[PDB]
A paper describes a structure:
C0020187 is a human monoclonal antibody specific for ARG2 that was derived from phage-display selections on naïve libraries of scFvs based on human Ig variable regions. We wanted to improve the affinity and potency of C0020187 to enhance its efficacy in vivo. The parental antibody, C0020187, showed inhibition to human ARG2 with an IC50 of ∼890 nM, with an inhibition curve that lies to the left of the small-molecule inhibitor NHLA (NG-hydroxy-ʟ-arginine [Millipore]).
The high-affinity complex of Fab C0020187 bound to trimeric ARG2 showed a surprising 1:3 stoichiometry (C0020187:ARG2) due to substantial negative cooperativity in antibody binding. A sample of this complex was purified by SEC prior to setting up crystallization trials; however, unexpectedly a 3:3 complex was found within the crystals obtained, perhaps reflecting the relatively high-protein concentrations required for crystallization. The asymmetric unit contained a trefoil-shaped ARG2 trimer and three Fabs, which were bound to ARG2 on very similar binding sites. The parental Fab C0020187 binds to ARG2 close to the active site, but does not appear to sterically block access, which suggests an allosteric mechanism of action. Antibody binding induces a large conformational change in several neighboring regions of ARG2 (residues 34 to 40, 71 to 88, and 150 to 159), with the first group of residues relatively close to the active site. The interface area between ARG2 and Fab C0020187 calculated by PISA is about 654 Å2 when averaged over the three interfaces in the asymmetric unit. Most interactions are between the regions of conformational change in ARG2 (interface residues 35 to 39, 78 to 86, 152 to 157, and 178 to 179) and CDRH2/CDRH3 and CDRL1/CDRL3. Residues within CDRH3 and CDRL3 form a hydrophobic cleft on the antibody surface, but surprisingly residues forming the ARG2 epitope do not insert deeply. Residues with the largest changes in accessible surface area on antibody-binding and located in the center of the interface include: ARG2 Y82 (van der Waals [vdW] interaction with VH L100a and π-stacking with VL W91), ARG2 L81 (vdW interaction with VL W91), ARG2 I86 (vdW interactions with VH A97 and VH L100a), and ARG2 L85 (vdW interaction with VH A97). There are also a number of strong polar interactions including H-bonds between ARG2 K78 and VL S95a, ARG2 N84 and VH Y58, and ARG2 S155 and VH S53.
Author numbering:
A (entry chain MMM): 2 to 27, 27A, 27B, 28 to 95, 95A, 95B, 96 to 210
B (entry chain III): 1 to 52, 52A, 53 to 82, 82A, 82B, 82C, 83 to 100, 100A, ...
Write the structure that this text describes.
Amino acid sequence: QSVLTQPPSVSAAPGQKVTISCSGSSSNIGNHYVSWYQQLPGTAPKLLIYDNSERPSGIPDRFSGSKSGTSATLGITGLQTGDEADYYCGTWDSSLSALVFGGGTKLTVLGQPKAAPSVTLFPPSSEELQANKATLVCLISDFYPGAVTVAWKADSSPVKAGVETTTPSKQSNNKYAASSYLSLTPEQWKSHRSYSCQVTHEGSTVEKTVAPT
Amino acid sequence: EVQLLESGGGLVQPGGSLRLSCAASGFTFSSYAMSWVRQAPGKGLEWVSAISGSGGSTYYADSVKGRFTISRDNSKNTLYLQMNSLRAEDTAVYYCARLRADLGLYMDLWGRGTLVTVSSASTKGPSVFPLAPSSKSTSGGTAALGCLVKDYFPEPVTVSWNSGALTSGVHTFPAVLQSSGLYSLSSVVTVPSSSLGTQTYICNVNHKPSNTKVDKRVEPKS
């Protein structure tokens, strides 16, 4: 779950410093203490920061954390490729009565240089429609760093139901690529003016749009 | 010198049950409380449950309340999680985590995790759908076509174009595990717009695990 709000992706070059923010409310960050977890790809999470600003022994002084009101912050100086990971912000929520975490922030130590994502949105096929199914297909390719945000529009209304999207994996050109599928009924497809796939890479967004006729 | 080790991960059908164990060593197990945290594939961490140091006091996420059941045997240094009526949503890696609440809440030592895959789905061949020409004013530019491979299990399928004759401009994407628990992927290939008029394009989709091979022609729209 993503009870807490973290930024999906942050990026820096080796030797630099980054800050990851965590947005909450009174019930969670407001009155209770925050912790930071480093999940290296494939391996389990590890305790990085606890009690807002405390490091376990063996965790280096490059890592530190801060908090005020309904937001907290993780600082990393002396960036190295080893730190490249998914970072999680964790605290207590008293109004949900549950231990809660942020959606997680993927860190991309910049070795090679950035690339802007190419989006290709094929629509439901005549064939598929006749089969009483409808899949919008959004193919995203040739981007770096390997972390995108994918959003779907029914006309201009946001859609998060019937959406499945890949984790970015580098193809034969050492560049990341991912895919997103929106599952609709034929009725949903035909009962809207247009559908759009919005891919948000770094500060930018590329949108592709498709018309039934 | 100190560690937690999860076991009893498995595949179970919808409405099924399963018992996860977590072996601990290097400390007085009953001196600390424990916690189950799960990570759905390609999603964020989610707290599931926790248990007291005495071993008698149990708390649960509203998602798993009354279906899951934390427990521990301090004589044998083991945590457990009995999971009943498991549904698709429960599929994740489950990590047993030592819980420390001195000043605030933090989990100070995790296990390697263990996978639980609720599956209603067995071995199924794919449906193969014809991708649009996308002659949407690309004009002189690269125009690309492809094939949708939908609802096949287990992995993998292989895609070739004109029996492997065409490979320059081909891009085949990783599959997605759907909410159905069913794999789907696409393979797209860019050949010149002008060529479409007089060049045939057919994707060959072979699913070894269901021994399904499909050849599917793809050419404009009406």
